[PDB]
Structure formats: structure tokens, C-alpha cells
Amino acid sequence: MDIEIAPQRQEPLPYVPEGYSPFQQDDIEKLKTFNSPYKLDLDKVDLLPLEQIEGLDPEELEDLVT
């Protein structure tokens, strides 16, 4: 006996709450990635101003270096 039939189960338009922006793949790399705590980060030449206000004998030679 001939069968009955159902519409294709489509996809609901995606829900995205509260103006959420997802974290990108780039963002994720920046969170995984160790960088040394020790790394730090930090025109005309001007003249400088002026401020205001027979000799020693063998044993004698050895005494000298000792």
C-alpha cells in the first residue's frame, strides 16, 4: 500500500545570542602560545652642554713579585 511522506528536515537559521562574536582561529593561537616573560619592549642630534664649579739583586727581585 502506497506509503506516506514527510518534508525534508531542513536546518533552523542559526541562533546567535547577545551579539556574540566567536573567537577566531588566530585568536586561539594567541591563547595557546608561550612567549618568554623576559622579553621586553621599548631625530636631531643636539650638542652637549658644559658644567660648572746594577739594580735590585736576584732575591730583591723575587721579594717584589711575592
Partner: protein
């Protein structure tokens, strides 16, 4: 005893010597240079004694060259070498050896002007060694005096001077008085060209013999030569130009001044010439060797102002050379005079020439003079000055190579000044890096010349240059390098087993080793060694603070900060406290870092819920430090620590004042998230992180204070800031990356928690999915663990039991990578998850030991485990969790006590009702039971509802109505009806609150989330006002709630009869349970749903597969019919009449009541034998009415009546009227009651109510209630709550049904996806006709509708009808329907339009609720998937009965009656026919 080795080849020794001098220099081991030089000095003298004078000589030079910046390539260079820290412990003796050699080589004649120059300025070249060898040196002088063919007088003078100076016995030679005369003979006083010196020598001689028989100056110089010096002087630009001096030597001390002054004026009175004289004058000044006086110094200062002022006045390179020479002779004066300020001016003039002349030669000369001064000044505290100077030089250099050249004069090991501290070398190298190296812009490794291994390691460690040859270096040097670089290439096995015997870094081995392990761990994202090295540092470094008696390295400072931060991020809170305390203890050395110890001690107290110590910490810190002067880093540090909620006392107000007004008023740049003040990127990142943390905790405060909306908004700001923080170009620093990890995971936890509280499964799924995704790619174990622990709890709450298993396994695995003994808060979480509550509360005692009394943490865990604690020892903060727990504990106790009395046990297994009895106006004692219940009633009434999550509000409501129900069946209670009223609207609250939160949170302006509030209180009024309004509507309807009791498992009915002004409720115990019926049904539904999917039907090809699909669906249909049958015949035994639409005739009812009571009087043992009729318990009318509502003609009439009897007997029983069933005359009850009921039915008037509203709770939505045999013929719509019903009715002035005009503006959608082509065939006809003779109507067919057109369809139609899958979610978002306020009555005639996805203890959702929230007043959908031929049969029938045609009238049916009359057309009466359902108000077409 030591052996002696013959040396056959000296070059072997030199090799060993140079090899050692190089190593020692490279490893900063300066003290071993001394002991090596001592050997070397002995080598030189041994050469001298064996008459290897040629070899000895170049050995001296070798010794000197290997130990000094300056280089020598003659003995003359040795002789005039300045003292420095590098050589001053041997230089004296070296020069004496050099003089010995000059003597024995008989080279005195050729060395003569140098030997004179030496001794002329003996104060500078010689007489500084405090241990100077007197007898030797002065003997050397006499011997020179002896052999010299000239200047015998000069030597004589010096020798006499020394012997006086050093108190030596003349008798090292005849008479000393005669010696002077002998010097005075014409030939002895013969000096040749070297007469220039004489003045210097005599002056030094005079000093020791002034006031004695001094050889006077006139004995040597005739009066003629001496008079005409001064005579000519005051009668004249008068100098021997050819000899670069003055015409006269031995110039009078006073006549100096008139010459001095002369020239000054001469300057004032072409530039080439003047300088030339200037050189002449100042060269004679050095020569004469006069002691400095103001007159000379005034002229100097003046002469150098003159030169400087006229640099640009120089053009020729002849004047240029003259200038360099004058500057050279002047610099030498400053060293003769110890004039450091004055020398630094000569460096300045040289530098200025280097700029004006644009000459690298002058700049090189400038750099070196700078270095000279440094070596001479010997103040390693000064060197910041030099580095900043060399910054300006380097900047001034003419090319890239020239800048690198100047750099190397500064990046030079003798600049270490024999400093043996790691702190100094780090300090020097980092500053050279920041201020100088970075200006060189080099991208390949330069191995800088004449610098140590250590210097190269710290400098390139800080660089980003790619291929540094670090493996050239000792292990400890490579270890500092790796730690600086964040790169770790050292083999573990080797790091333990190599060693250099001689290295400065051996003095710092433990420190270097733990800095390496810390940074190694972090690099690999582990904590393997964290605990080992924190303990090591505390006990073997930090503890020996005052042993080591040394300034602390920046290397160590930075280490400690990184260690505190990694301890804190891993919650090693115990170690954190001990470390921090220890630091704040060794304050003598670590004072600069103590701000970090203070902040991190605070966070550790808080993490261990030691609120006591945290608060002491708070208020001390606040007073003890001012912000207006604190640098931005310390202010960030102070502010960050004060953010924690537990630092307040649920005082969102105070918190907001502080961070929102006070703190911004005092440190604005703490809130400059746009970086307008342009801070260094590293601090700017830290500012954003501060503000992220503020918004994160502000979410926590708001939500703990029932401010769901604004807490959601805060959270979202926190997340947006984090997204913007990641976009900054920065190469994120470890400390900030961890900060952001802690913060970002927190805000997901917080958002999910906020949405659990209001029951929104929809948002929780979204967030939990986003979080899960992120975790995956992460690698930090403490973050991965904590997130998995959280998600696992979440999967428990939503009862997604498969993910629950998977994430428990993952969480348990993740825990392995944690230090279980160090992190107690992760351990208790692990123990909890795994049901080891015993091991839990007791590992909390082994972690706090005797400190257990200052942490709320073991009490907080008591609260999580369900216990309620002593109010006096509970934090104000956690007081609501406390009471909530108490309520439940109080309930389990009272319920379990009552339940072991057969009386109450039986009562809990009985259909119960309220009001059932009219009031007056012993295993468990009855007074005790009424007492415990009134106690429960009042404890439930005490609690603040705004502190409840929706699922708890639900349980408290049911607990509240159960307590009222037991009480009222047991005694008569104070304020009877009012308690039923407040309870009716209490049970409605949890129905309403999720929907309103859904609506509000969805119409939130998105601008709110990027700019850097409802509640249960007002909602309480709206819920009870709804009920008051409904009651007063006088509508002749029933409003019946259907709910499920989580606590008891009871079915729960209530009814609201507005016309009768009556409120009744009853509890049905329940053969299957509600959760079993729910299972059996879901199984049926999910199977039929399955049979429906195109995946399955598409694979059906043969006659055989056809019949199987039909067997299965007919079978599924019978299973569902049977389940509903079971429910009918179990769940409502005796009370199906509660649903009856019949109204009793009042005149007839009263005669029935007389009879009814007479019948009870004569047939109940109690009424027959005890008291009188005035003491009998009287039953409420609506209970009596139930009898009149029975149909004696029905087949199961007697079962239903019997059950009514039981109900009534029960009412009398619980109120104290016993009736042994043993002696009730049931035969007579049966006969007489049936008689009176037959009489009533046979004569009754037929007046019924107009419509039935079913308030259906989300838990009961899935059941097709309307198809129960006592419901299937009734006009019914569903509603989700009293508040929704009453606003819908207020919207249409309480007029049922909803007249809806059908004569125009009707929308339709048909087969929007071309997957239902037979359906299209059937309806193509009527729909296309209606768009014809019915204006502003629209049809969309075989065509995907676009979002904006059905949004306008919905808000601009008198009728909306839709045929296709679901309710059109695939063409329009949930969000926009929800933003609407008025929607058209909708026929959602598709698969599963009214279905709902269920999520455990959270609220479900589906298309149905969204329309209601869009302001749809009537929406019709299917509870599950339906198949096309049958459902279209139903639709066709639905339209025809309602009147939906093109010839608009008459007596059509309402949507309600029309639906129930149309179910029957379906072949599968349940799988398809039970599927349609209506929410909202009944409509009729007009």
C-alpha cells in the same frame, strides 16, 4: 713540598697563560686573574735572573695586554699606564720590573725622556699603590742616577725626596749632606733638552725638605736664567711655537697668573693661531707639574669654554688637528688633577666637534675618553650615565657600521670593573640593550669583540635575532640564554652532569637552575617541577638572603614575579602564601617586589576562602598606598587585587561606586581602553585585562543579587574586550596570556551559569558549544581540567547523559596533569565529581591542618553537598544557599518521620485535595505533626525568591503547595483561602519567569554589549494580578493546570472557575509513573519520527518494504493508544470529573446535598455511633458535585463512583473521622448514591462552561492530553501560564472567541521546498483562489520564502497559514519573531512545529513559544512529525469546518471544536491525529 719544572720552550707557557687569562675573563672569575698574574710575575723575574732580558721584556707586555683594555707594544707603554681596578694590585711592581730591565739592558739613555716623564708625574703613575715597594723603587732611582749620562740632578732630587718620603735610611749609600753638593757640580746639573722637567722634580723635592737645609733652586739655576724669566714675562702670544710650549721652563708660580690672565684676554681679543698658542701654554703646565690652584682652574674652565664656542669657527683640517691636540693635552691635565667633572667637559667638546665636523675620528676619540674616565673613576654605580651617554654617541655616528663600531667601545668586558655580581652584569647588559643595541638594527649575530660569554648571553638572550651560536657557551650561560629566549634546547640528562670548575655563574647555580625549570615547564605547559622549585627557592635561595648579602638581580626579580603568577594561575595557593610571606619577610632585599607579594598573597587568601585574612589585606593596602603617585604598573597591581566579590559583602552598590566612580576619578588611565595616552603595548594590554576582570566580577555580583539582565550585559562586555585585546598586534606575554585564559574561561562559566539560573537551555547549549570548541585547541591543563569539570556539571543538569560520561572521563584524565597535593580547589572538585565526599572534606583538613579555622572552604563544600550550616558561622554571601539547603533538609526529615506512621504514609499515597473540608469558622502525634508542618510552611515563606534559580523556584513552589495540602487535610488553617491564592500564583511564577526572561533578553539593544532590569519582585505582582483579573473576568470557563511534582512524582491538577469564583487543586499519586510514561512515549515518538524522515522513506522501493513501514506505523499507533489508555485508567481514578465541562443546577444540587449527607449519616460507622450531626466533618461542595457529574449509563460507572467514595472517606479520615471499611455499608452507599445520581441526571438542566484553558507546564507539554477520552470532545486551547492567558484576554477585552476576519490580508506558504508535491497538488486550488477575490493576500509556493517577506507576512496578516516542515525556522530566525509584538493567528501545519527539544532541569523550547512571545494570540502546530496524506486529510477538514473558503460566514466552528471534530479523518488516529495542538485563544472566522 712542590716540584719545579725546567722550561725548555716558553711558548708552551704562554699558551697556557693566554688560555687561562681568556677563560677567566670570559667567565667573570676575576680573582683567579690575580693568582695567575702572580705566577706570571714570577716567570718574568726568573727570566731576568737568568739574563733573558729580551724575553722578560715581552713577557711584561704580554702580562699587561692580557689584563687591560689598553694595549702596550713597548716598555714605555707599561711605564706610563694608569692605575685601574684591573691592574692596581700589580702595576706598581710591573713598572719596577720594567725599570729593572731598562737598567740591565743599559737602555737608560734612549728611555730617558720617558723615565723622566714617569717620575715627573710619580703621583699618578707610581705613588698610588698603597703597598708600593719603597726600598726597591728608591733603590731603582739611585741606580738610574748612577748610570745616567744626563740629568743626574733630576734623579738625585727624586731619590732624596723618596728617602724622606718613605722614611728610608740613607745608609743604603758616605754622607748624605755631601750628596747634594755632588749633585750640584756643573756636570751633574747637566740636563740637556730635558731641563723642562726640572721644575716638577724640585717642587716634589722641596715639599719634603721645606724648612730644612734644602738644596735651593738658585744652586741649580743661575739668577740670570731665573730673573729674565719673570723680566720678559711682564713685557710683551710668547711661546716656543716649534716646541709646543712656553719659551721658559721653571716659570714663577705668581708669574704664571699674569701669563694665565694675559692669554684669557688674548682669547677675548684667527682661531687656528690661538689654539696653537693654547696648546703651547697648557703643555708647559703639565711639564712644570704645578699643584692645581684656582688660577689654573679658572683659566682651564675658561679655555675650554673658548674652544667649545668656536668649534663651528673651524674649517681647515689644520685647525681640526690643532683642536684634537689641545683637547688631548687638556684631558691629561684632568687625570693629573683628579678632575672628573672637568674631564667630562672635555669629552663634551670632543663630542661636539664629532658632530660639527661630521667626523667619526672625533667620535671614536670621544667614546674612548669616556671609557677611560670610567676605568679611572671606577664607580660601577655610575655606569647608567655612560650607557645613556653612549646612546647619544651611537645616535650621532655617521653610518650603520660606524654605530656598531662605537657600540663596541661600550660593550666591552673591562667595563665590568671586576664586578662579581650577577645583578650588575644583568643591569649593565639590559640597559646596553634597551638604550644602545636596538639602535644598531642588526639581524644577524655579531660576536662582539672583547666581551665575555656572560655579556653575550644576557644581551642576545634579550634579542630576537634568529641563529645565535649559544652552544659555544658553558651550560649555565646557555641556561640564562634559554630562559631569556623562551626556547629550551638543553638536553636534560646533560644539564645535570656538566660543570665548569671556574665560573661566576657557579655562584648562582641554584637560581639559574630553577629559573630554567620554571620557564621550561611553562614552555611545555606543565607544572611538573613547579612545587619542587618553589620550595627550593624558598629554602635554599630566598632563605639565605642575608648570607648572600647582595643586591638582587633583575633576573631574579622577574623570576619571582613569573613564579607567583604561575603559582596563582595553577592555584598552588599554599605555596603562594608561604612564598609571599617569605618575600615580605626578606624585605631588606626584596622591597621592590613586595607589591607583588602583597597582591598575590591577597588572591591566595581569597582562592582558599580565607576571607578573614583577605580583608585585613584589603584595608591595609587601601590606606598604605596612594594612587595619584603610583606608577601605572603598581596601580594596575593594586586595583586588580581588589576586584574579588568576596572582598565585599554582596554590596554591588559599594563595588560599583569604587570601580565606577572613585577609582576612575583617581587613576583615569586605568580605564583608557582606547589607549589615548599611548602607553607601552604591554601595559595597555594589562589595562584592558583590568577592565575585563572588573566586568567579569560585576557579572557575578549582579547575578548573585538577582540582576540577570545587567549581569548578562557585563559578561558580554568582558568577552568583547577580550576579543579586542586579541586583535592588538602584541606578541602576548606569558603573564598576560595566562591572565586572559583565566578571564575568558570565567566569562563562559559565568554566562552559562546565568542562563542556567533562568533555565534557558537554548543559550546554554550555544555557549557550552563555544567553550567546548576552544578548550580543544588549548593546552593549559588547569584550564582544560576546570572547563571539563564545568561542562560535566552542565551535562548533568541538562541530563545529556552520554556527554556526561564522556566529559567525566576527559575531566578525570585531565586531572592527571595537575599537582593533586598543591591545588586543593582542583582536588576537591575532582573528589566531588567522583563521589568521594569522604576523601573530600578530609583532604581539606590535611591541607589546612591547624589553619582550618580561618577558611570558609570546608563549609562552602558542606553547602555544595546539601548540608546547611550554623547561621552564625555562614558567610552572609552564602546564606541563601544555606537556607535553601535547610528547607530541603527540613523536608526530608519531616517527611520521613511522618512516613513511618501508617496514617501519614497512607495519606501520601492518596488523592489529596484542597479545599476539601469546611472549617469550623499514634506512631506520630497529631499536634507534633501540625507543628512541624506549620514550621515548614513558614520557613518556605521566609525565603527571598529573587535568590532562586528557576528550577529551585519550581521545587519550592511544589513543596509549598504540598505542605499546604497536607496541612489543610489535617487541621483548619489561619487565612485558608488567601494561602491557596498566593500558592496559585507562586506555582505560576516558574512558568512565567523563563518566558519573560526569554522575551526581555532578546529585545536587548546590541549597543549595550559594546559600551564600556526586571526581577521576581515586580514579576510577583504581575503573576497575582493576572489571577485576580482572571477570577474577576466572570468568564464561564475552566482554567486547569497540569503539572508534575519533581519531589513527589505526583500529578498536579488545579482549576480556576471565574464564574463560580472557585479555586480547587488536587494531588494524584500514580500502573506507570510520570517518568515512565514520558519514557514510553518518547520512545514511540522518536520511532515514528524516524519512520517519517526522507532518508528512510526514500529507501522504500518494493511491495515488501512498503508493507513493513505500514506494519511499523500501525504498530506505533497502537502502542500510543495503549499508553494513553493506561494513563486514563490509572492517573485519574475517580477524578475525571475535575475536567468535566458540566455546571450543576443549583436548585437540584442542594436537594442532592441533603440526600448525600443523609446517605453518609446512615451508612458510615462514625456517623452512626459517635457525636451528633453538628460535629460531623462537612465536605466542600465541589467534591459533592463530582458525584452529580458521573454518568450512570457509562460502563465503568461503579469504579469511578467507588473511587469518589474513597476520596470522600479519605477527606473524613485525615480530618479525624475513622470509618473501618469492615463496617461501612457499601451495598447501601452504592444503591442509594446511584439512585440519587440517576434522579439528578434524568432531570438536570444542561448548562456547561464555554471553553477550557489548559495551562500546560513544559514538563507536561509532550503528552497529547486533548486526546484522553474525557478531553477529546471538549473545546480546548493550551496556554503556558496564567500571566500569558490574562494578557491575551486583556488584549481582546475578554471576549471569546476571537473574531478574526477572513475577508482580506491573509498569508499562506505552500511546500516552500518542493518536497511535498502531493500536498501542493491538494491545496494549490483553494489558496491561489483566495489570493484572487481577497485583497492584500500573499501566497508563496514551491518557493523558499525569504526572511523579510514572512516577517511582514506575520505582522501584517489577519491569518497566517504555513504548510511544510516545522514552523519556518529555516526561513526566519527565532530572534525576529520574538521582537514582534503582534503576530497573525498561525496554522503551523507541518512536521513537529509544536515539538520541543528537552534539556533535563532546564526549560525546553520550540517554535510554539516563540510565536506566543511574538504576540501571536492563537498558534496551531503538531507535537511530532506527521505523514502527508493523513495530515492533509486533517487540514482539509479543519479549513472546511472552520469556514476557511473563498465565499465568506454562517455557523462555522471555532478553531477548537473544529480541530477535535477533525482528528478522526486521519487513518492513523494517534500517530497523526493526536499530533495537532493549539496554544492561545480559540478563534472563529467571521
Amino acid at each position: 713540598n712542590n716540584i719545579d719544572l725546567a722550561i725548555e720552550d716558553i711558548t708552551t707557557v704562554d699558551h697556557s697563560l693566554n688560555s687561562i687569562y681568556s677563560l677567566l675573563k670570559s667567565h667573570h672569575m676575576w680573582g683567579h686573574i690575580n693568582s695567575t698574574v702572580k705566577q706570571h710575575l714570577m716567570i718574568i723575574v726568573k727570566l731576568i735572573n737568568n739574563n733573558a732580558l729580551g724575553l722578560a721584556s715581552s713577557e711584561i707586555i704580554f702580562l699587561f695586554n692580557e689584563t687591560n683594555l689598553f694595549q702596550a707594544h713597548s716598555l714605555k707603554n707599561i711605564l706610563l699606564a694608569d692605575f685601574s681596578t684591573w691592574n692596581d694590585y700589580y702595576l706598581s711592581n710591573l713598572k719596577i720590573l720594567a725599570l729593572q730591565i731598562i737598567l740591565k739592558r743599559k737602555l737608560v739613555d734612549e728611555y730617558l725622556p720617558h723615565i723622566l716623564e714617569l717620575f715627573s708625574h710619580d703621583k699618578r703613575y707610581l705613588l698610588k699603590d698603597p703597598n708600593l715597594k719603597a726600598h726597591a723603587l728608591t733603590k731603582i732611582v739611585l741606580s738610574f742616577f748612577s748610570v745616567t749620562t744626563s740629568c743626574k740632578v733630576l734623579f738625585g732630587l727624586k731619590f732624596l725626596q723618596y728617602i724622606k718620603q718613605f722614611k728610608l735610611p740613607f745608609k743604603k749609600f758616605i754622607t748624605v749632606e755631601c750628596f747634594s753638593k755632588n749633585l750640584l757640580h756643573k756636570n751633574y746639573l747637566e740636563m740637556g733638552p730635558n731641563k723642562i722637567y726640572l721644575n716638577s722634580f724640585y717642587l716634589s723635592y722641596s715639599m719634603l725638605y721645606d724648612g730644612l737645609d734644602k738644596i735651593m733652586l738658585l744652586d741649580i739655576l743661575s739668577y740670570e736664567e731665573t730673573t729674565e724669566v719673570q723680566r720678559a714675562i711682564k713685557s710683551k702670544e710668547y711661546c716656543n711655537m716649534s716646541e709646543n710650549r712656553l719659551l721658559w721652563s721653571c716659570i714663577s708660580v705668581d708669574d704664571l697668573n699674569v701669563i694665565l690672565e694675559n692669554a684669557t684676554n688674548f682669547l677675548q681679543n684667527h682661531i687656528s693661531a690661538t689654539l696653537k698658542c693654547l696648546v703651547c701654554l697648557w703643555s708647559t703646565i703639565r711639564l712644570e707639574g704645578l699643584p692645581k690652584n684656582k688660577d689654573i682652574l679658572r683659566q682651564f674652565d675658561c679655555t675650554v669654554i673658548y674652544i667649545n664656542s668656536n668649534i663651528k669657527s673651524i674649517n681647515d683640517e689644520s685647525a681640526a688637528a690643532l683642536l684634537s691636540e689641545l683637547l688631548g693635552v687638556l684631558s691629561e691635565i684632568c687625570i693629573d688633577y683628579k678632575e672628573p667633572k672637568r674631564l667630562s667637559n672635555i669629552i663634551s667638546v670632543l663630542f661636539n666637534a664629532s658632530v660639527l665636523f661630521k667626523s667619526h675620528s672625533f667620535l671614536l676619540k670621544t667614546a674612548n675618553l669616556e671609557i677611560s674616565n670610567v676605568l679611572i673613576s671606577n664607580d660601577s654605580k655610575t655606569s647608567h650615565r655612560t650607557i645613556l651617554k653612549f646612546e647619544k654617541f651611537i645616535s650621532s655616528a655617521q653610518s650603520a657600521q660606524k654605530k656598531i663600531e662605537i657600540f663596541s667601545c661600550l660593550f666591552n668586558v673591562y667595563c665590568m670593573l671586576r664586578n662579581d655580581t650577577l645583578s650588575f652584569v644583568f643591569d649593565f647588559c639590559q640597559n646596553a640593550f634597551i638604550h644602545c643595541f636596538t639602535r644598531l638594527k642588526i639581524t644577524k649575530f655579531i660576536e662582539f669583540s672583547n666581551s665575555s660569554e656572560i655579556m653575550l648571553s644576557v644581551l642576545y638572550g634579550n634579542s630576537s635575532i634568529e641563529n645565535i651560536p649559544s652552544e659555544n657557551w658553558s651550560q649555565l650561560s646557555r641556561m640564562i640564554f634559554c630562559s631569556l629566549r623562551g626556547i629550551f634546547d638543553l638536553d636534560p640528562l646533560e644539564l645535570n652532569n656538566t660543570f665548569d670548575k671556574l665560573h661566576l655563574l657557579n655562584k648562582y647555580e641554584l637560581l639559574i637552575r630553577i629559573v630554567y625549570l620554571l620557564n621550561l615547564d611553562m614552555s611545555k605547559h606543565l607544572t611538573t617541577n613547579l612545587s619542587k622549585i618553589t620550595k627550593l627557592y624558598i629554602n635554599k635561595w630566598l632563605q639565605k638572603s642575608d648570607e648572600k648579602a647582595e643586591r638582587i638581580s633583575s633576573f631574579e626579580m622577574d623570576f619571582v614575579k613569573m613564579l607567583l603568577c604561575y603559582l596563582n594561575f595553577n592555584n598552588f595557593d599554599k605555596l603562594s602564601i608561604e612564598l609571599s610571606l617569605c618575600i615580605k619577610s626578606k624585605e631588606k632585599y626584596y622591597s621592590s617586589i613586595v607589591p607583588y607579594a602583597d597582591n598575590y598573597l591577597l588572591e591566595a587568601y581569597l582562592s582558599l576562602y580565607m576571607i578573614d585574612d583577605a580583608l585585613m589585606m584589603k584595608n591595609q593596602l587601601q590606606k598604605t598606598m596612594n594612587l595619584s603617585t603610583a606608577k601605572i604598573e603598581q596601580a594596575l597591581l593594586h586595583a586588580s587585587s581588589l576586584i574579588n566579590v568576596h572582598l565585599w559583602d554582596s554590596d554591588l552598590t559599594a563595588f560599583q561606586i569604587y570601580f565606577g566612580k572613585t577609582l576612575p576619578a583617581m587613576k583615569p588611565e586605568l580605564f583608557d581602553i582606547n589607549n589615548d595616552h599611548n602607553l607601552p603595548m604591554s601595559l595597555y594590554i594589562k589595562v584592558i585585562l583590568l577592565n575585563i576582570k572588573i566586568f567579569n566580577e560585576s557579572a557575578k555580583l549582579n547575578i548573585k543579587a538577582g540582576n540577570v539582565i545587567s549581569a548578562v550585559i557585563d559578561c558580554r562586555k568582558a568577552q568583547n574586550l577580550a576579543l579586542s585585546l586579541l586583535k592588538k598586534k602584541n606578541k602576548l606575554s606569558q603573564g598576560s596570556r595566562l591572565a586572559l585564559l583565566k578571564s575568558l574561561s570565567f566569562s563562559f562559566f559565568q554566562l552559562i551559569k546565568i542562563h542556567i539560573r533562568i533555565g534557558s537551555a537554548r543559550d546554554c547549549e550555544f555557549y557550552s558549544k563555544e567553550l567546548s570548541r576552544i578548550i580543544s585547541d588549548l593546552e593549559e591543563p588547569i584550564i582544560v581540567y576546570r572547563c571539563l569539570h564545568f561542562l560535566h556539571r552542565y551535562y548533568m543538569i541538562t541530563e545529556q547523559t552520554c556527554l556526561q560520561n564522556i566529559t567525566l572521563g576527559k575531566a578525570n584524565k585531565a586531572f592527571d596533569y595537575l599537582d593533586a597535593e598543591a591545588d586543593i580547589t582542583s582536588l576537591t572538585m575532582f573528589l566531588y565529581d567522583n563521589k568521594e565526599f569522604v576523601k573530600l572534606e578530609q583532604s581539606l583538613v590535611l591541607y589546612f591542618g591547624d589553619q582550618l579555622e580561618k577558611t570558609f572552604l570546608p563549609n562552602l563544600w558542606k553547602l555544595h553537598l546539601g548540608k546547611d550550616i550554623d547561621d552564625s558561622i555562614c558567610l552572609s554571601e552564602y546564606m541563601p544557599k544555606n537556607v535553601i539547603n535547610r528547607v530541603h533538609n527540613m523536608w526530608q526529615k519531616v517527611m520521613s518521620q511522618l512516613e513511618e506512621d501508617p496514617f501519614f504514609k497512607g495519606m501520601f499515597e492518596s488523592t489529596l485535595g484542597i479545599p476539601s473540608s469546611l472549617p469550623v469558622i499514634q506512631k506520630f502525634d497529631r499536634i507534633a505533626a501540625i507543628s512541624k508542618l506549620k514550621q515548614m510552611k513558614e520557613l518556605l515563606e521566609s525565603l527571598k525568591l529573587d535568590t532562586l534559580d528557576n528550577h529551585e523556584l519550581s521545587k519550592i513552589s511544589s513543596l509549598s503547595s504540598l505542605t499546604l495540602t497536607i496541612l489543610s487535610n489535617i487541621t483548619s488553617i489561619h487565612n485558608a483561602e488567601s494561602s491557596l491564592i498566593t500558592n496559585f500564583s507562586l506555582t505560576d511564577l516558574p512558568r512565567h519567569m523563563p518566558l519573560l526572561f526569554d522575551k526581555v533578553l532578546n529585545n536587548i539593544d546590541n549597543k549595550n554589549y559594546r559600551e564600556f532590569n526586571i526581577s521576581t519582585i515586580t514579576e510577583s505582582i504581575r503573576v497575582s494580578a493576572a489571577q485576580k483579573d482572571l477570577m474577576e473576568s466572570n468568564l464561564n470557563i475552566n482554567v486547569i493546570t497540569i503539572d508534575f511534582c519533581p519531589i513527589t512524582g505526583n500529578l498536579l491538577l488545579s482549576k480556576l472557575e471565574p464564574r463560580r469564583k472557585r479555586r480547587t487543586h488536587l494531588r494524584l499519586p500514580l500502573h506507570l509513573s510520570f517518568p515512565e510514561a514520558t519514557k514510553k512515549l518518547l520512545s514511540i515518538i522518536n520511532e515514528s519520527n524516524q519512520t517519517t524522515s526522507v532518508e528512510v522513506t526514500n529507501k522504500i522501493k518494493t511491495r515488501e518494504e512498503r508493507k513493513s513501514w505500514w506494519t511499523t506505523r500501525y504498530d506505533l499507533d497502537k502502542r500510543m493508544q495503549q499508553l494513553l489508555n493506561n494513563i486514563e485508567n490509572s492517573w485519574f481514578n475517580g477524578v475525571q470529573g475535575f475536567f468535566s465541562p458540566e455546571v450543576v443546577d443549583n436548585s437540584l444540587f442542594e436537594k442532592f446535598k441533603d440526600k448525600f449527607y443523609e446517605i453518609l449519616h446512615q451508612n458510615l460507622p462514625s456517623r452512626k455511633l459517635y457525636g451528633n450531626p453538628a460535629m460531623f466533618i462537612k465536605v466542600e461542595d465541589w467534591v459533592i458535585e463530582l458525584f452529580l457529574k458521573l454518568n450512570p449509563q457509562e460502563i465503568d460507572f461503579l469504579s469511578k463512583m467507588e473511587d469518589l467514595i474513597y476520596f470522600v472517606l479519605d477527606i473524613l479520615l485525615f480530618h479525624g473521622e475513622e470509618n473501618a471499611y469492615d463496617e461501612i455499608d457499601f451495598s447501601m452507599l452504592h444503591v442509594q448514591l446511584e439512585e440519587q445520581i440517576k434522579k439528578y441526571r434524568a432531570t438536570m438542566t444542561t448548562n456547561s462552561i464555554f471553553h477550557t484553558f489548559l495551562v500546560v507546564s513544559s514538563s507536561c507539554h509532550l503528552f497529547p492530553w486533548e486526546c484522553l477520552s474525557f478531553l477529546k470532545d471538549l473545546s480546548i486551547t493550551r496556554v503556558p501560564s496564567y500571566v500569558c492567558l490574562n494578557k491575551l484576554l486583556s488584549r481582546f477585552h475578554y471576549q471569546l472567541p476571537l473574531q478574526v476576519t477572513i475577508e482580506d490580508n491573509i498569508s499562506m506558504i505552500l511546500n516552500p521546498n518542493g518536497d511535498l508535491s502531493r500536498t501542493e497538488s491538494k491545496f494549490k486550488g483553494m489558496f491561489q483562489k483566495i489570493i484572487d477575490a481577497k485583497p492584500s493576500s500573499q501566497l508563496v509556493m514551491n518557493e523558499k520564502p525569504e526572511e523579510e517577506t514572512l516577517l511582514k507576512m506575520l505582522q501584517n496578516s489577519n491569518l497566517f497559514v504555513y504548510i511544510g516542515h516545522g514552523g519556518g525556522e529555516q526561513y526566519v530566525r527565532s530572534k525576529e519573531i520574538k521582537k514582534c509584538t503582534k503576530i497573525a493567528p498561525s496554522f503551523l501545519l507541518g512536521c513537529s512545529s509544536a515539538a520541543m527539544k528537552y534539556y533535563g532541569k532546564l526549560e525546553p523550547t520550540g517554535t510554539i513559544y516563540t510565536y506566543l512571545l511574538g504576540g501571536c494570540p492563537m498558534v496551531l502546530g503538531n507535537l511530532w512529525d506527521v505523514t502527508d496524506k493523513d495530515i492533509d486529510k486533517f487540514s482539509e477538514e479543519l479549513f472546511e469546518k472552520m469556514g476557511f473558503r473563498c465565499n465568506t460566514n454562517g455557523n462555522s466552528l471555532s478553531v477548537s471544536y473544529a480541530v477535535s471534530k477533525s482528528r478522526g479523518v486521519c487513518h492513523l488516529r494517534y500517530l497523526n491525529g493526536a499530533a495537532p495542538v493549539i496554544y492561545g485563544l480559540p478563534i472563529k472566522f467571521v
